[PDB]
Amino acid sequence: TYKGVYELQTLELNMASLNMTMPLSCTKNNSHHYIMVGNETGLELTLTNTSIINHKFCNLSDAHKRNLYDHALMSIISTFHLSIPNFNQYEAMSCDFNGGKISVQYNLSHTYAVDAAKHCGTIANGVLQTFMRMAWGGSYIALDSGCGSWDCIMTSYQYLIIQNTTWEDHCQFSRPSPIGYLGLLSQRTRDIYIS
Amino acid sequence: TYKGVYELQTLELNMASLNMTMPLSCTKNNSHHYIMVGNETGLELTLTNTSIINHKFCNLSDAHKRNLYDHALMSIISTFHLSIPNFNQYEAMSCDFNGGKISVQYNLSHTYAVDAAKHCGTIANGVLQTFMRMAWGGSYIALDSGCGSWDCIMTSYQYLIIQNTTWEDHCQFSRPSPIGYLGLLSQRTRDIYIS
Amino acid sequence: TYKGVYELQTLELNMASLNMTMPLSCTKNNSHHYIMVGNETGLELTLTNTSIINHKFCNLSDAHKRNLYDHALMSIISTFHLSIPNFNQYEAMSCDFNGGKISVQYNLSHTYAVDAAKHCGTIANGVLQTFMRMAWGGSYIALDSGCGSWDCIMTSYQYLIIQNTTWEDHCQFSRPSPIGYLGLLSQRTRDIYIS
Amino acid sequence: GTFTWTLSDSEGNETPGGYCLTRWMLIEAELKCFGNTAVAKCNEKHDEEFCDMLRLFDFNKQAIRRLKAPAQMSIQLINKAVNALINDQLIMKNHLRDIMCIPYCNYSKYWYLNHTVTGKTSLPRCWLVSNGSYLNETHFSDDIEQQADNMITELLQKEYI
Amino acid sequence: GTFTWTLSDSEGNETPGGYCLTRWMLIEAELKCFGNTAVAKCNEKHDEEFCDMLRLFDFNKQAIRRLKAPAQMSIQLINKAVNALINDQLIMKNHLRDIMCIPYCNYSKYWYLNHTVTGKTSLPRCWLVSNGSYLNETHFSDDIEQQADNMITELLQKEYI
Amino acid sequence: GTFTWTLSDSEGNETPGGYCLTRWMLIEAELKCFGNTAVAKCNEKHDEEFCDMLRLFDFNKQAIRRLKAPAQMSIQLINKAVNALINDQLIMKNHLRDIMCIPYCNYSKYWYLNHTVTGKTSLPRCWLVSNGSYLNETHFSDDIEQQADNMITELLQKEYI
Ligand SMILES: *[C@@H]1O[C@H](CO)[C@@H](O[C@@H]2O[C@H](CO)[C@@H](O[C@@H]3O[C@H](CO[C@H]4O[C@H](CO)[C@@H](O)[C@H](O)[C@@H]4O)[C@@H](O)[C@H](O[C@H]4O[C@H](CO)[C@@H](O)[C@H](O)[C@@H]4O)[C@@H]3O)[C@H](O)[C@H]2NC(C)=O)[C@H](O)[C@H]1NC(C)=O
Ligand SMILES: *[C@@H]1O[C@H](CO)[C@@H](O[C@@H]2O[C@H](CO)[C@@H](O[C@@H]3O[C@H](CO[C@H]4O[C@H](CO)[C@@H](O)[C@H](O)[C@@H]4O)[C@@H](O)[C@H](O[C@H]4O[C@H](CO)[C@@H](O)[C@H](O)[C@@H]4O)[C@@H]3O)[C@H](O)[C@H]2NC(C)=O)[C@H](O)[C@H]1NC(C)=O
Ligand SMILES: *[C@@H]1O[C@H](CO)[C@@H](O[C@@H]2O[C@H](CO)[C@@H](O[C@@H]3O[C@H](CO[C@H]4O[C@H](CO)[C@@H](O)[C@H](O)[C@@H]4O)[C@@H](O)[C@H](O[C@H]4O[C@H](CO)[C@@H](O)[C@H](O)[C@@H]4O)[C@@H]3O)[C@H](O)[C@H]2NC(C)=O)[C@H](O)[C@H]1NC(C)=O
Ligand SMILES: *[C@@H]1O[C@H](CO)[C@@H](O[C@@H]2O[C@H](CO)[C@@H](O[C@@H]3O[C@H](CO)[C@@H](O)[C@H](O)[C@@H]3O)[C@H](O)[C@H]2NC(C)=O)[C@H](O)[C@H]1NC(C)=O
Ligand SMILES: *[C@@H]1O[C@H](CO)[C@@H](O[C@@H]2O[C@H](CO)[C@@H](O[C@@H]3O[C@H](CO)[C@@H](O)[C@H](O)[C@@H]3O)[C@H](O)[C@H]2NC(C)=O)[C@H](O)[C@H]1NC(C)=O
Ligand SMILES: *[C@@H]1O[C@H](CO)[C@@H](O[C@@H]2O[C@H](CO)[C@@H](O[C@@H]3O[C@H](CO)[C@@H](O)[C@H](O)[C@@H]3O)[C@H](O)[C@H]2NC(C)=O)[C@H](O)[C@H]1NC(C)=O
Ligand SMILES: *[C@@H]1O[C@H](CO)[C@@H](O[C@@H]2O[C@H](CO)[C@@H](O)[C@H](O)[C@H]2NC(C)=O)[C@H](O)[C@H]1NC(C)=O
Ligand SMILES: *[C@@H]1O[C@H](CO)[C@@H](O[C@@H]2O[C@H](CO)[C@@H](O)[C@H](O)[C@H]2NC(C)=O)[C@H](O)[C@H]1NC(C)=O
Ligand SMILES: *[C@@H]1O[C@H](CO)[C@@H](O[C@@H]2O[C@H](CO)[C@@H](O)[C@H](O)[C@H]2NC(C)=O)[C@H](O)[C@H]1NC(C)=O
Ligand SMILES: *[C@@H]1O[C@H](CO)[C@@H](O[C@@H]2O[C@H](CO)[C@@H](O)[C@H](O)[C@H]2NC(C)=O)[C@H](O)[C@H]1NC(C)=O
Ligand SMILES: *[C@@H]1O[C@H](CO)[C@@H](O[C@@H]2O[C@H](CO)[C@@H](O)[C@H](O)[C@H]2NC(C)=O)[C@H](O)[C@H]1NC(C)=O
Ligand SMILES: *[C@@H]1O[C@H](CO)[C@@H](O[C@@H]2O[C@H](CO)[C@@H](O)[C@H](O)[C@H]2NC(C)=O)[C@H](O)[C@H]1NC(C)=O
Ligand SMILES: *[C@@H]1O[C@H](CO)[C@@H](O[C@@H]2O[C@H](CO)[C@@H](O)[C@H](O)[C@H]2NC(C)=O)[C@H](O)[C@H]1NC(C)=O
Ligand SMILES: *[C@@H]1O[C@H](CO)[C@@H](O[C@@H]2O[C@H](CO)[C@@H](O)[C@H](O)[C@H]2NC(C)=O)[C@H](O)[C@H]1NC(C)=O
Ligand SMILES: *[C@@H]1O[C@H](CO)[C@@H](O[C@@H]2O[C@H](CO)[C@@H](O)[C@H](O)[C@H]2NC(C)=O)[C@H](O)[C@H]1NC(C)=O
Ligand SMILES: *[C@@H]1O[C@H](CO)[C@@H](O)[C@H](O)[C@H]1NC(C)=O
Ligand SMILES: *[C@@H]1O[C@H](CO)[C@@H](O)[C@H](O)[C@H]1NC(C)=O
Ligand SMILES: *[C@@H]1O[C@H](CO)[C@@H](O)[C@H](O)[C@H]1NC(C)=O
Ligand SMILES: *[C@@H]1O[C@H](CO)[C@@H](O)[C@H](O)[C@H]1NC(C)=O
Ligand SMILES: *[C@@H]1O[C@H](CO)[C@@H](O)[C@H](O)[C@H]1NC(C)=O
Ligand SMILES: *[C@@H]1O[C@H](CO)[C@@H](O)[C@H](O)[C@H]1NC(C)=O
């Protein structure tokens, strides 16, 4: 006890009970990360060496008109996309919204020696910093910069892939939490270099 | 009295005295709503079954260059337009700024059975939710959803029309109040589905 | 002393010690204003009657891809540009980013009798009001409107020129301060007329 | 004593006269005055709808006098002022209550307690509405009584304890 | 007595029962109750991670009951609510601490002091983490002891001074 | 005791040494120290220009030490920090006062009262300027005297009342 009579006690919150109102971020490992979106469904976010979309096309505006997707899942994805620092297209994103499915891929793999040398930009900086905000408590794939000393990071991965999935227990490395989404949602001021 | 000696008293503010600094929202009935903009002038906002603009054109950028309009009235209208959730053009708005007059019409009437089934989008969701924020204390034309249980609404009306008018007493259903405008003005974070 | 025993004392902060984290605004005279950006470098902002860029071109997006500039200097310039009230291009800005240099010029000189009569717009209003926010404590070139009674100002100057410079003592009329930049950075809500 | 919520320095609020609401602020009464002890709470408060209306009125007063013949409001002056003057979070809380069918402040009536022997009053709180009408005293009686107790404590802890 | 952080009027928080956290709020304990004296601090606080979680839980409770079968959350209801419900500045402070390798709140565990004779407890404060682990009691012992002193002062200043 | 406005945990502020401003924070004095009782007010304050400068200095201290050789500031680190560190509303209030010809804080000089027998000082408040010059003591004498009274109350209410 502290000062004779105070016992230190611990409270820990179960944020899974918030799943009907807020999306909840989770982590499974160094690559897989998750967002619970509904009671049964959510998004899977992965970091890989393998491209699954070989398209250089997205045609997002046609996908939107097609309107065969869950608006909640789409809303979260577009939240992510438009929260990217130094937002622009830079090509970068290819997608597939045929039917009602969702598959979105970012070309982090863009990085080559000249842009690697610049570090603080060229698509990967903005995508990775958004990923890290969605993923609070996730795996800090900043590697040698894992505790965040520096704010420009690079990863070994080539692609960030976001897909519509089934909610199953994952959350092996972190507690479900609304903070990631809320962070991205509230941080809407100015964060660009080019416009 | 409360606890023997406290008399409960009522204070009510006259917000019309704020008309030289802030625009003031008002309501007349289920359709007509108003904004006082100046000492003598303001905007009339109506919900109707009759189109007054048969144009599929707005040419807002040419109207802006023409520059024959009151900047204050225009500023309020563009505040409204750019505050629309899921902002995009989607055609949606037609206008007439010939001479110094203002007439702006939104195609809420777009709604047909497929989009009606979707509810949470397709132009009307975004326009109606902006209208309801401008109109605090106005007529809650959400109808069966009048107290706002649910956040996706539909109305019987086909068009939202905004026009330059003369300030006359209206304000039959509500107190003049700066809150509507201030609400729209301060709520500038993120509210989209498509971008 | 106050109330017998309280001596009034003065504290004044040396904000130059903040130069490694925040850009610092300064003023030299009625025209020259400065931003310290790094330990050795910064931006010079001037108000002149002489154009140095005779181009009607900027090609900012090509400059960005060229990527021979200091991202910090560019970030501050684009902060300024995108903070302009009633933001649009309106032509207005011409630039030169050949090599790694920075030279940006705004056509305040646009003003002629019709637009001068309107006052509250036509490029100069937005550029000048951004300049004044970057320049807290700077020279209030609002002239007869120097204390800011009114919020639409005009200056005698024709061009606002921003260039990459060497930090040398300047700061003759003001204390280095992060407030100007911070003001522009945090003020990100809504401030347009046209969109 | 002085206030932090006014824009004007000293002129915005004097200590000895307390703080008064004039006939152009109020609808039915010609005059209502509050002690600075209660009004001063808006110096600190991050809540209370009344305090935003109070700031908007101070702004209007200064804006008119400073900009002689403000003519047509410029809109841009107020837009900057809004970010400086009001609690945006609070408007959004009342917006949330309006939606979801929860009693909420529509910024019209406010209520306060007034002692029947002395002149002490509380800071006004927003009278809430629901389904187009004002709530009865019996629905918000918990807050009315809590306010009475708060006033009693302040009256009792006078000069020293 | 009553709370200002709830959306619901009176129903959101009653005075005599104090404020309780149920089995769906907590992970291991079935029930934890705090006195309103401590919980009420969230009525005023512009800080404390615990108070944002507390507001999000109140929101979830009302949102579910009001929108019968919320089915798939609409997202837009919560986005508006977020601006009304949480301290964005606070999330950003913890974000800054996460970056730059400074112990920060990851919104999981909270700690509080509980008197061993009486039932008095403090408002919970976030247990911080660094390098993937929770900090030891010896690293934040200054705050634990300060909290104990704050509780002692409140226990001593009972009714009158 | 401890502070809530620092980013650093405990190291940011120790209790027994009070809180000091070094020669690189101040322009003319080599050293000025304030008691934690007054500095700690920034733990709670939603106002006082001094508290934002105080937070920016803490940020600068940590940012430099954490990012060894910050070289050229990245800008993006500070932009995120700004949302976490400063009162934006307060800058906008001073902006409004600058415009409309109202005395306003230009974040340079601050003033405080210092007791001539004991070492007690107040938290500094911004010295305002108008028309390019600092205001005289006679224009803001109401606040100087109010501050003196506030300090007197604190000195008198020592240990118990
Ligand atoms: C704030 O930071 C804290 C840091 O502690 C996060 O809290 C949790 O921390 C623990 C580590 O102390 C995380 O890991 C857990 O380990 C338990 C034991 O691991 C052994 O057994 C597993 C078998 O699968 C081996 O792989 C491992 O190497 C060890 O030998 C596991 O039992 C935990 O749960 C697992 O099993 C259950 C089923 O019984 C599954 O449902 C789980 O998904 C998981 O597979 C767990 O792996 C722990 O993950 C951290 N999170 C949680 C939720 O407990 C806080 O989460 C963080 N805050 C936020 C918001 O993220
Ligand atoms: C917060 O919510 C409250 C809810 O009460 C709004 O406050 C006002 O509430 C009253 C209802 O109690 C509104 O209606 C008023 O009714 C009065 C009596 O109505 C009879 O007579 C009229 C004759 O025209 C009939 O149509 C009606 O059916 C009844 O038989 C009217 O006298 C009121 O004013 C009318 O006449 C005057 C001229 O004397 C005109 O200037 C008015 O514009 C109007 O025509 C009124 O109609 C009342 O409208 C609500 N508002 C106001 C301003 O009083 C609060 O307004 C709301 N807060 C905000 C910010 O909106
Ligand atoms: C908030 O508002 C205050 C207003 O007072 C600003 O504070 C400073 O105010 C003084 C005026 O009181 C500014 O001017 C200073 O004048 C000193 C004396 O001037 C005589 O000598 C010069 C010779 O160059 C003549 O030109 C002049 O006409 C007078 O005859 C100068 O000594 C000051 O410094 C100069 O010399 C030093 C080298 O010794 C250089 O390093 C300086 O850059 C400069 O050339 C100065 O000119 C003063 O500029 C105001 N600022 C500062 C930093 O002191 C606050 O700055 C303002 N707050 C903010 C954030 O801006
Ligand atoms: C997602 O959030 C919802 C809402 O918080 C969680 O649903 C809730 O589940 C609990 C049980 O775990 C329900 O509590 C009650 O349990 C008793 C028996 O123990 C039962 O008799 C009651 O009828 C009730 O079921 C609670 O009512 C229920 N809330 C609602 C409105 O659904 C859900 O479990 C969360 N999802 C996950 C994966 O945690
Ligand atoms: C729009 O706002 C303005 C400013 O609040 C209101 O103008 C004000 O009107 C009042 C009278 O109603 C003026 O008060 C004074 O009245 C006495 C006589 O009673 C007179 O002697 C004074 O000269 C003065 O007129 C007040 O000064 C005036 N303010 C200004 C600067 O114009 C206006 O009434 C509001 N509009 C509406 C529709 O309510
Ligand atoms: C820009 O900001 C940096 C950081 O605040 C300032 O650098 C600092 O300079 C001071 C000296 O003025 C250093 O203090 C120390 O001085 C003693 C001797 O007096 C020396 O023995 C120590 O080694 C140290 O140099 C301080 O450490 C240093 N901080 C760092 C990390 O560089 C810089 O002066 C500011 N620029 C301008 C133009 O003011
Ligand atoms: C870490 O994540 C990877 C995926 O990036 C896991 O490997 C595959 O995961 C999928 C989806 O669950 C399975 O269908 C595959 O069968 C897995 N691959 C293999 C070879 O089994 C990997 O197992 C995860 N690992 C941990 C926690 O060690
Ligand atoms: C985006 O649109 C292009 C349009 O060219 C699609 O590419 C295919 O183009 C050929 C003609 O060269 C058509 O016959 C195919 O039917 C088009 N495919 C599709 C799916 O429409 C491209 O595939 C589209 N990409 C996405 C993600 O929709
Ligand atoms: C495939 O995965 C590896 C990791 O297993 C990625 O890592 C890079 O590997 C190359 C070759 O050894 C090194 O030069 C890089 O420095 C590594 N990257 C980092 C951040 O350390 C590799 O990038 C992935 N993709 C490809 C196309 O090789
Ligand atoms: C409710 O608003 C409608 C308009 O949408 C009113 O009907 C017309 O209003 C205009 C403008 O004031 C008049 O010029 C027309 O003459 C009105 N129509 C008719 C047939 O008289 C309607 O009167 C309003 N009603 C209320 C409060 O009952
Ligand atoms: C927007 O621009 C179109 C341009 O075609 C306008 O339509 C008319 O086009 C015919 C030629 O086909 C011209 O002779 C008319 O003079 C044009 N009308 C006008 C008003 O310019 C359309 O009307 C314009 N719409 C708006 C709202 O300005
Ligand atoms: C014309 O006004 C009526 C209301 O008087 C609008 O209301 C719709 O009417 C149809 C036909 O009875 C119903 O099927 C719809 O369900 C009603 N809408 C709602 C929201 O309940 C009608 O939309 C208006 N316009 C047109 C072109 O009919
Ligand atoms: C005020 O600023 C102007 C520049 O706009 C100064 O004039 C020139 O400044 C440049 C840059 O330092 C020098 O290279 C030129 O030689 C200066 N011109 C002349 C004729 O000497 C001007 O000196 C500044 N003045 C003050 C404080 O009086
Ligand atoms: C923006 O691009 C135009 C492209 O026309 C540049 O103008 C020159 O155009 C002639 C052909 O008419 C070429 O031979 C020159 O090489 C172009 N100049 C340059 C620098 O590319 C214009 O100068 C460019 N402006 C900027 C600021 O880059
Ligand atoms: C050149 O500098 C002068 C100032 O020295 C600028 O000032 C204008 O001068 C004209 C002619 O006397 C006046 O009619 C304007 O009213 C002055 N402007 C203001 C705001 O008072 C002049 O604009 C500059 N440029 C040019 C091309 O003349
Ligand atoms: C994504 O949604 C589509 C809807 O047509 C479904 O067929 C597909 O299986 C879903 N994807 C996953 C991984 O469950
Ligand atoms: C709108 O402004 C024009 C200015 O040319 C005027 O002629 C017209 O009558 C105004 N409209 C209304 C409804 O008063
Ligand atoms: C701007 O940067 C370029 C880099 O190529 C340099 O040559 C030029 O001298 C710099 N401009 C100034 C005014 O120092
Ligand atoms: C409260 O109830 C009484 C009794 O029915 C009624 O007379 C009074 O008008 C009501 N007041 C309000 C504000 O509802
Ligand atoms: C604190 O240190 C003790 C002794 O090494 C250890 O047993 C205990 O688990 C540690 N607790 C935490 C939270 O680090
Ligand atoms: C205040 O007035 C006195 C007397 O005129 C003068 O000496 C002093 O310098 C003035 N101080 C300020 C800050 O204006």
mmCIF file of C-alpha atoms in Angstrom, chain C residues 74-191:
data_model
loop_
_atom_site.group_PDB
_atom_site.id
_atom_site.type_symbol
_atom_site.label_atom_id
_atom_site.label_comp_id
_atom_site.label_asym_id
_atom_site.label_seq_id
_atom_site.Cartn_x
_atom_site.Cartn_y
_atom_site.Cartn_z
ATOM 1 C CA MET C 74 8.542 23.729 -49.486
ATOM 2 C CA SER C 75 6.223 22.597 -46.731
ATOM 3 C CA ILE C 76 6.115 26.072 -45.255
ATOM 4 C CA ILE C 77 5.420 27.653 -48.634
ATOM 5 C CA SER C 78 2.634 25.267 -49.450
ATOM 6 C CA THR C 79 1.245 25.893 -45.929
ATOM 7 C CA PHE C 80 1.053 29.536 -46.821
ATOM 8 C CA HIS C 81 -0.497 28.918 -50.211
ATOM 9 C CA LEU C 82 -3.205 26.581 -49.027
ATOM 10 C CA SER C 83 -4.103 28.807 -46.092
ATOM 11 C CA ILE C 84 -5.228 31.586 -48.398
ATOM 12 C CA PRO C 85 -8.880 32.652 -47.808
ATOM 13 C CA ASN C 86 -11.064 32.054 -50.770
ATOM 14 C CA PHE C 87 -8.441 29.677 -51.996
ATOM 15 C CA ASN C 88 -8.271 29.048 -55.685
ATOM 16 C CA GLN C 89 -5.544 29.587 -58.171
ATOM 17 C CA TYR C 90 -6.999 32.556 -60.092
ATOM 18 C CA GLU C 91 -3.751 32.350 -62.064
ATOM 19 C CA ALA C 92 -2.226 34.544 -59.257
ATOM 20 C CA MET C 93 0.924 32.572 -58.583
ATOM 21 C CA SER C 94 3.850 32.119 -60.859
ATOM 22 C CA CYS C 95 6.997 30.281 -59.671
ATOM 23 C CA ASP C 96 10.480 29.093 -60.432
ATOM 24 C CA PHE C 97 11.852 25.864 -58.992
ATOM 25 C CA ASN C 98 14.627 25.253 -61.459
ATOM 26 C CA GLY C 99 17.468 23.450 -59.769
ATOM 27 C CA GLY C 100 17.009 23.465 -55.999
ATOM 28 C CA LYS C 101 16.044 27.155 -55.640
ATOM 29 C CA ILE C 102 12.762 28.611 -54.557
ATOM 30 C CA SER C 103 11.106 31.693 -55.981
ATOM 31 C CA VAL C 104 7.348 32.220 -55.678
ATOM 32 C CA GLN C 105 5.456 35.329 -56.769
ATOM 33 C CA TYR C 106 1.874 36.407 -56.128
ATOM 34 C CA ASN C 107 0.121 38.897 -58.496
ATOM 35 C CA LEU C 108 -1.333 41.327 -55.814
ATOM 36 C CA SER C 109 -0.899 43.794 -58.712
ATOM 37 C CA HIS C 110 -3.944 42.212 -60.222
ATOM 38 C CA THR C 111 -5.911 44.963 -58.486
ATOM 39 C CA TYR C 112 -7.353 47.613 -60.819
ATOM 40 C CA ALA C 113 -10.345 49.927 -60.298
ATOM 41 C CA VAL C 114 -13.237 47.436 -60.547
ATOM 42 C CA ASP C 115 -11.733 44.839 -58.299
ATOM 43 C CA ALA C 116 -10.293 47.587 -56.082
ATOM 44 C CA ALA C 117 -13.864 48.772 -55.532
ATOM 45 C CA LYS C 118 -14.936 45.289 -54.455
ATOM 46 C CA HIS C 119 -12.020 45.161 -51.951
ATOM 47 C CA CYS C 120 -12.963 41.883 -50.114
ATOM 48 C CA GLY C 121 -11.514 39.429 -52.615
ATOM 49 C CA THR C 122 -9.867 39.326 -56.025
ATOM 50 C CA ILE C 123 -6.616 37.585 -54.991
ATOM 51 C CA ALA C 124 -5.104 40.319 -52.874
ATOM 52 C CA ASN C 125 -7.564 39.956 -50.012
ATOM 53 C CA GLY C 126 -6.716 36.323 -49.519
ATOM 54 C CA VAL C 127 -2.989 36.692 -50.023
ATOM 55 C CA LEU C 128 -2.637 39.721 -47.772
ATOM 56 C CA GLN C 129 -4.623 38.150 -44.952
ATOM 57 C CA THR C 130 -2.384 35.139 -44.977
ATOM 58 C CA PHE C 131 0.711 37.285 -45.013
ATOM 59 C CA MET C 132 -0.557 39.162 -41.954
ATOM 60 C CA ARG C 133 -1.067 35.902 -40.067
ATOM 61 C CA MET C 134 2.362 34.634 -40.871
ATOM 62 C CA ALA C 135 3.660 38.048 -39.783
ATOM 63 C CA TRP C 136 2.440 38.489 -36.228
ATOM 64 C CA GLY C 137 4.081 41.514 -34.807
ATOM 65 C CA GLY C 138 5.199 42.466 -38.297
ATOM 66 C CA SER C 139 4.648 45.663 -40.124
ATOM 67 C CA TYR C 140 1.008 46.299 -40.422
ATOM 68 C CA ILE C 141 0.807 47.181 -44.006
ATOM 69 C CA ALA C 142 -2.868 47.806 -43.935
ATOM 70 C CA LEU C 143 -1.748 51.405 -43.846
ATOM 71 C CA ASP C 144 -4.758 53.550 -42.837
ATOM 72 C CA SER C 145 -6.284 50.286 -41.598
ATOM 73 C CA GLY C 146 -3.018 49.474 -39.731
ATOM 74 C CA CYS C 147 -4.705 48.631 -36.322
ATOM 75 C CA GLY C 148 -7.164 46.382 -38.190
ATOM 76 C CA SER C 149 -10.446 48.168 -37.601
ATOM 77 C CA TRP C 150 -11.640 46.597 -40.895
ATOM 78 C CA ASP C 151 -10.820 43.131 -42.221
ATOM 79 C CA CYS C 152 -10.484 43.920 -46.004
ATOM 80 C CA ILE C 153 -7.190 45.593 -46.747
ATOM 81 C CA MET C 154 -5.221 46.851 -49.669
ATOM 82 C CA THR C 155 -1.574 47.732 -49.920
ATOM 83 C CA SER C 156 0.485 49.828 -52.264
ATOM 84 C CA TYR C 157 2.563 46.834 -53.237
ATOM 85 C CA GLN C 158 2.268 44.886 -56.436
ATOM 86 C CA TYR C 159 3.924 41.585 -55.640
ATOM 87 C CA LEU C 160 4.451 39.185 -52.765
ATOM 88 C CA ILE C 161 7.656 37.314 -53.286
ATOM 89 C CA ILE C 162 8.845 34.345 -51.306
ATOM 90 C CA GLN C 163 12.437 33.129 -51.696
ATOM 91 C CA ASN C 164 14.913 30.616 -50.135
ATOM 92 C CA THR C 165 17.520 32.640 -48.120
ATOM 93 C CA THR C 166 20.317 32.461 -45.579
ATOM 94 C CA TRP C 167 19.536 33.143 -42.005
ATOM 95 C CA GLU C 168 21.352 36.261 -40.882
ATOM 96 C CA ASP C 169 20.271 38.565 -38.199
ATOM 97 C CA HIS C 170 17.173 40.388 -39.471
ATOM 98 C CA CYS C 171 14.336 40.588 -36.886
ATOM 99 C CA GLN C 172 14.701 44.389 -36.548
ATOM 100 C CA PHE C 173 11.075 45.136 -35.954
ATOM 101 C CA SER C 174 9.927 42.013 -34.109
ATOM 102 C CA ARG C 175 10.812 39.094 -31.877
ATOM 103 C CA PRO C 176 11.284 35.710 -33.540
ATOM 104 C CA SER C 177 8.098 33.823 -32.881
ATOM 105 C CA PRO C 178 6.478 30.485 -33.823
ATOM 106 C CA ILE C 179 3.010 31.970 -33.464
ATOM 107 C CA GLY C 180 2.601 33.105 -37.040
ATOM 108 C CA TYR C 181 3.165 29.660 -38.501
ATOM 109 C CA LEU C 182 1.204 27.972 -35.717
ATOM 110 C CA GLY C 183 -1.714 30.308 -36.329
ATOM 111 C CA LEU C 184 -1.910 29.389 -40.009
ATOM 112 C CA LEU C 185 -1.391 25.746 -39.259
ATOM 113 C CA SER C 186 -4.155 25.441 -36.659
ATOM 114 C CA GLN C 187 -6.675 27.632 -38.524
ATOM 115 C CA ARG C 188 -8.039 24.933 -40.765
ATOM 116 C CA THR C 189 -11.829 25.039 -40.792
ATOM 117 C CA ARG C 190 -13.613 27.014 -43.469
ATOM 118 C CA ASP C 191 -12.644 30.334 -45.025
#
